[PDB]
Amino acid sequence: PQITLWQRPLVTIKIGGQLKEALLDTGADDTVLEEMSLPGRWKPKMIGGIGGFIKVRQYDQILIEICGHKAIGTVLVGPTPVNIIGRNLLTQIGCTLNF
Amino acid sequence: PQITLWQRPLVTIKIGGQLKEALLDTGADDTVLEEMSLPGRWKPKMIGGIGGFIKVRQYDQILIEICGHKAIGTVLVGPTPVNIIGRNLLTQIGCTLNF
Numbered sequence A, B: 001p002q003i004t005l006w007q008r009p010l011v012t013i014k015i016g017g018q019l020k021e022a023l024l025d026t027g028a029d030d031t032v033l034e035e036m037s038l039p040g041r042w043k044p045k046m047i048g049g050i051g052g053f054i055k056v057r058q059y060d061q062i063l064i065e066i067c068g069h070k071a072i073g074t075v076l077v078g079p080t081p082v083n084i085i086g087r088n089l090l091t092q093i094g095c096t097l098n099f
């Protein structure tokens, strides 16, 4: 697809068998989702945004689809204002910025 | 150009005669720069997200050059940790997400 930016680039993702809405965010190094259950062990991580740093849970090698494109990678979970797809998965699905 | 997302998409901008580095951020609704002077009227605004909110000054109808592409739009000024080019100006230079 080709996605313009006159509105938020919100897409449907699938993780854990469930459909969720998420923002394609080239401003984000990593992917962070609202509180949810994921399998396995997690590791601690700090991420910094406009107001400061938050603590999140880091889960590795998690299956996730983005607009139907299947990916496998690191997913962070924590008190994010919105589900964010960051560059770690955007790169996996072959996303680039063009003008 | 086509900009890869293997790395943060930082680009050179020109504003108020100054050259600065800024992040092309599809996740940001608006453009926000570190503390600087700009011409004209302004109004206070709060913007927020991970780590909370910050107070900014909103200036409208500000000319900016992004990778040599001229645009006009609202610029927010305040204690952001990084300069951010948001969708309000990305649209004007014709920037799209593609995969």
Ligand SMILES: Cc1cccc(C)c1OCC(=O)N[C@@H](Cc1cccc(Br)c1)[C@H](O)C[C@H](CC(C)C)S(=O)(=O)c1ccc(F)cc1
Pocket (backbone or CB within 6 Å): A023, A025, A026, A027, A028, A029, A030, A031, A032, A047, A048, A049, A050, A081, A082, A084, A086, B025, B026, B027, B028, B029, B030, B031, B032, B047, B048, B049, B050, B081, B082, B084, B086
């Ligand atoms: C999710 C994530 C994981 C690891 C590392 C990073 C940087 C990251 O993204 C965090 C995030 O908050 N990114 C911002 C842009 C940003 C902000 C601070 C530092 C860096 Br570096 C990058 C996200 O792309 C844009 C945000 C919004 C997002 C949380 C929906 S925002 O900055 O809060 C914003 C709000 C309103 C505006 F008008 C403009 C910008």
Ligand SMILES: [Cl-]
Pocket (backbone or CB within 6 Å): A044, A045, A055
């Ligand atoms: Cl912890």
Ligand SMILES: [Cl-]
Pocket (backbone or CB within 6 Å): A072, A073, A074, A088, A089
């Ligand atoms: Cl990953």
Ligand SMILES: [Cl-]
Pocket (backbone or CB within 6 Å): B072, B073, B074, B088, B089
């Ligand atoms: Cl604008």
